[PDB]
Amino acid sequence: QVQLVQSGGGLVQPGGSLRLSCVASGFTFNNYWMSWVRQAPGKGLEWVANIKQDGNDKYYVDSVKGRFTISRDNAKNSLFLQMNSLRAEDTAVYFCAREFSSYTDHLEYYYDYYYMDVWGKGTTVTVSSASTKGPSVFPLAPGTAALGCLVKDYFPEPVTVSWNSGALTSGVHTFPAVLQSSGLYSLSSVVTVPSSSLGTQTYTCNVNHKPSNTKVDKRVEL
Amino acid sequence: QSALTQPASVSGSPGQSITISCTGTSTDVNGYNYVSWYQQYAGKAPKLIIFDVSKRPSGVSNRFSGSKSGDTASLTISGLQAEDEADYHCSSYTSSTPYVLFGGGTKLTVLGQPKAAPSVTLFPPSSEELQANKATLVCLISDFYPGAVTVAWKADSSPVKAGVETTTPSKQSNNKYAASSYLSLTPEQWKSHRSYSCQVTHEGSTVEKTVAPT
């Protein structure tokens, strides 16, 4: 079948750079215009750039002219995108797509319209000025009772949370993290337990943040 | 001067028909016909389902149809199915760079389960965080459906918008939704007020929780 697979995405800081790749298969690559489309978290699509089949004619969206350079190599069914002077607003998932020709001819005139019919799965690009940093773990002190741990200001994702070294798995809810304006993440893990055990049963959340090689076991007391 | 506009979201129940509009497409006779729609499932890549205003790539269900009048393009889905739930983006021509635009995307929800009000738990700043010269209120929202809510905080009884960080909703294992909101304060602010409140609005109804310095 027809396929497109990109790669090269990653995490960098403002001003940094990345080189995206896209390998086609299942179709005559040098017969189509190829494009790069992006999608910022939670937003719509935006065409970034494309290149004619002969690799000469190149087009870009205004916000990346001068910083981004598209190129192709018909010899190896590959499409590339060199990204320089990266910005926070460039953060998004990048897809490479094929432009196909929808030809409708009415003699006196004809329409030659191009749309994207094949898309890759996409590669992620994150541009942030935040630096690797371990989290601060604060306890959320407590019929039943709710108690947990606040895993504050860490970068970048992810972090894992468990309770009593795994012995407590039911009534546990670890919430997706929130990206703060500061560029750092935070999340909360909470568990519901019997109120009568609060006096005898000890509770400890085991937090691990591999990016900064930091583990924290925080005891949550009454 | 140009920007396609499609509603952030729309809902419909199984068996019904639904329509998503997209104003702002070209009225230039030479570009009138350049209109398309793409479907996109969470985490997946887009897929062309309508081009040239109303043509369907082979494989795309005849339940999806496209039309246009004036500058408004419209996508119509009949006999809604649970698998139709996704994001839909309209694309159109515009007489100036970049020549081809995309709408903001419309999130289509197929009401497959009964409404569910959110559960709310609010935590006050921990003495350890306070003693570290900081304060964070944690509002945990869970088990709601549809997956859409808005949060409002209050210092005593007045609105407070500074220092509020709220996540987008996200699907839980039981298939309902969760979200959380954080309010940052100074230990002094925290102790200064009688109490704080986290108010969650969902489908026209609200659940508010309150906490106070002990």
Binding site: L107, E108, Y113 | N30, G31, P98, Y99, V100
Partner: peptide, 15 residues
């Protein structure tokens, strides 16, 4: 014979 070419990033009509 008016030729209309419309695609991302370019639009024109060849004589």
């Amino acid at each position: 014979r008016k030729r209309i070419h419309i695609g991302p990033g370019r639009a024109f009509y060849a004589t």
